[PDB]
Design an enzyme around this catalytic site. Sequence first.
Site, PDB file in Angstrom:
ATOM      1  N   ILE A 170       2.774  14.550  -0.743  1.00  0.00           N
ATOM      2  CA  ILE A 170       2.569  14.535   0.709  1.00  0.00           C
ATOM      3  C   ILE A 170       2.870  13.192   1.317  1.00  0.00           C
ATOM      4  O   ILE A 170       2.557  12.969   2.463  1.00  0.00           O
ATOM      5  CB  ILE A 170       1.084  14.959   1.131  1.00  0.00           C
ATOM      6  N   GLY A 171       3.469  12.280   0.583  1.00  0.00           N
ATOM      7  CA  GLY A 171       3.637  10.938   1.094  1.00  0.00           C
ATOM      8  C   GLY A 171       4.040   9.951   0.026  1.00  0.00           C
ATOM      9  O   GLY A 171       4.184  10.269  -1.126  1.00  0.00           O
ATOM     10  N   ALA A 172       4.250   8.730   0.458  1.00  0.00           N
ATOM     11  CA  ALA A 172       4.767   7.689  -0.391  1.00  0.00           C
ATOM     12  C   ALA A 172       4.035   6.445  -0.010  1.00  0.00           C
ATOM     13  O   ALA A 172       3.882   6.151   1.173  1.00  0.00           O
ATOM     14  CB  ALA A 172       6.228   7.508  -0.148  1.00  0.00           C
ATOM     15  N   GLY A 173       3.558   5.713  -0.996  1.00  0.00           N
ATOM     16  CA  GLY A 173       2.807   4.513  -0.716  1.00  0.00           C
ATOM     17  C   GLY A 173       3.476   3.342  -1.335  1.00  0.00           C
ATOM     18  O   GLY A 173       4.546   3.470  -1.946  1.00  0.00           O
ATOM     19  N   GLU A 174       2.817   2.195  -1.216  1.00  0.00           N
ATOM     20  CA  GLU A 174       3.318   0.970  -1.812  1.00  0.00           C
ATOM     21  C   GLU A 174       3.599   1.072  -3.331  1.00  0.00           C
ATOM     22  O   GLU A 174       4.509   0.422  -3.830  1.00  0.00           O
ATOM     23  CB  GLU A 174       2.333  -0.187  -1.557  1.00  0.00           C
ATOM     24  N   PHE A 175       2.791   1.834  -4.069  1.00  0.00           N
ATOM     25  CA  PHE A 175       2.838   1.797  -5.541  1.00  0.00           C
ATOM     26  C   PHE A 175       3.346   3.094  -6.146  1.00  0.00           C
ATOM     27  O   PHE A 175       3.490   3.212  -7.362  1.00  0.00           O
ATOM     28  CB  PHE A 175       1.444   1.495  -6.111  1.00  0.00           C
TER      29      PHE A 175
ATOM     30  N   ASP B  97      -6.061  -5.100   9.729  1.00  0.00           N
ATOM     31  CA  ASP B  97      -4.902  -4.259   9.907  1.00  0.00           C
ATOM     32  C   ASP B  97      -5.326  -2.931  10.493  1.00  0.00           C
ATOM     33  O   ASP B  97      -4.897  -1.831  10.066  1.00  0.00           O
ATOM     34  CB  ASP B  97      -4.219  -4.060   8.550  1.00  0.00           C
TER      35      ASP B  97
ATOM     36  N   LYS C  99      -3.187   9.113  -5.223  1.00  0.00           N
ATOM     37  CA  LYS C  99      -2.218   8.031  -5.197  1.00  0.00           C
ATOM     38  C   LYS C  99      -1.843   7.673  -6.620  1.00  0.00           C
ATOM     39  O   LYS C  99      -2.689   7.291  -7.386  1.00  0.00           O
ATOM     40  CB  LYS C  99      -2.819   6.808  -4.503  1.00  0.00           C
TER      41      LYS C  99
ATOM     42  N   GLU D  69       4.120   7.679  -5.286  1.00  0.00           N
ATOM     43  CA  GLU D  69       3.954   8.822  -4.426  1.00  0.00           C
ATOM     44  C   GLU D  69       2.531   9.264  -4.414  1.00  0.00           C
ATOM     45  O   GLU D  69       1.778   9.006  -5.347  1.00  0.00           O
ATOM     46  CB  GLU D  69       4.842   9.971  -4.856  1.00  0.00           C
TER      47      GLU D  69
ATOM     48  N   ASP E  36      -6.708   2.531   4.195  1.00  0.00           N
ATOM     49  CA  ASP E  36      -5.910   1.328   3.978  1.00  0.00           C
ATOM     50  C   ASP E  36      -6.697   0.011   3.827  1.00  0.00           C
ATOM     51  O   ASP E  36      -6.730  -0.845   4.708  1.00  0.00           O
ATOM     52  CB  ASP E  36      -4.864   1.194   5.060  1.00  0.00           C
TER      53      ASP E  36
ATOM     54  N   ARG F  50      -2.191   4.303  12.444  1.00  0.00           N
ATOM     55  CA  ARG F  50      -1.552   4.744  11.167  1.00  0.00           C
ATOM     56  C   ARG F  50      -2.408   4.541   9.905  1.00  0.00           C
ATOM     57  O   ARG F  50      -2.092   5.072   8.871  1.00  0.00           O
ATOM     58  CB  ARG F  50      -0.200   4.026  10.945  1.00  0.00           C
ATOM     59  N   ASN F  51      -3.473   3.747  10.001  1.00  0.00           N
ATOM     60  CA  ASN F  51      -4.364   3.529   8.884  1.00  0.00           C
ATOM     61  C   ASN F  51      -5.678   4.257   9.024  1.00  0.00           C
ATOM     62  O   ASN F  51      -6.653   3.911   8.365  1.00  0.00           O
ATOM     63  CB  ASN F  51      -4.583   2.027   8.714  1.00  0.00           C
TER      64      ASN F  51
END
Length: 263
Positions: free
Chosen positions: A15-20, A132, A39, A22, A150, A136-137
Amino acid sequence: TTEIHPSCVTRQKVIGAGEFGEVYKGMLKTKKEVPVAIKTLKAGYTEKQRVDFLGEAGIMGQFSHHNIIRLEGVISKYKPMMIITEYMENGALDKFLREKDGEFSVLQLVGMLRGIAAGMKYLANMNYVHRDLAARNILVNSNLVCKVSDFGLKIPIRWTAPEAISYRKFTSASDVWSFGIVMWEVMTYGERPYWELSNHEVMKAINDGFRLPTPMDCPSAIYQLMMQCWQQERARRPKFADIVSILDKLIRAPDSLKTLADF
Ligand SMILES: Nc1ncnc2c1ncn2[C@@H]1O[C@H](COP(=O)(O)OP(=O)(O)NP(=O)(O)O)[C@@H](O)[C@H]1O
């Protein structure tokens, strides 16, 4: 944090993609099965990514609050390493609001903001300065509860308080400035603060006594409150516990929201 067994988790869809790596939707079996976000840490992570990855779970695991994403647990002893959290059906707040533009009552929007604010009151009491905070977070679930997400060891100028920019002085009052920007995000159903203005213009306006304009059909109390979050001197901005209380007055007496800001 809780170490959990790979057997109890089952990934289902990306469902998404993160820094580290999918992020997936899945199912945790703690007995009884419950949706989760998952995650992953890509095979081939460096040591630095491993530590940053598990660290966020560490920070998150120190929190227990309705409007703060709940860590179910990590997988750090087997591969794919994972961070398992409560599943939030409606995903990120800014993107959700863009898809449902004009579809919420002013009371549902303000209740979203009180959820966020509450979570930020919790963080600020735990001495945690988010740095931050942005729509979006924030993640949103089937019942429209908004949870601050986040947490993690990149921050755009225009969500950021002038003192935090020029002196790099991040406090909870810095976060309150950001929260005003989130209010504007929520009330405009996901518009980008300062539109396509450059970071330079944006800081020139702010230092010149100029603020984001009132969103369409924004209650006078909601607009004024964001203007309270954007006072140049941070010591005058309301603290998060003031914000929660003002939003509760507004929710408890909803006819307060009938009068709009002008111009
Ligand atoms: N707990 C969760 N519940 C439901 N969805 C989640 C959850 N965590 C992350 N996601 C989704 O997965 C995406 C990526 O997760 P996240 O890492 O937290 O954001 P990111 O790294 O800032 N990347 P992106 O949101 O794509 O710009 C998010 O946009 C959400 O749609």
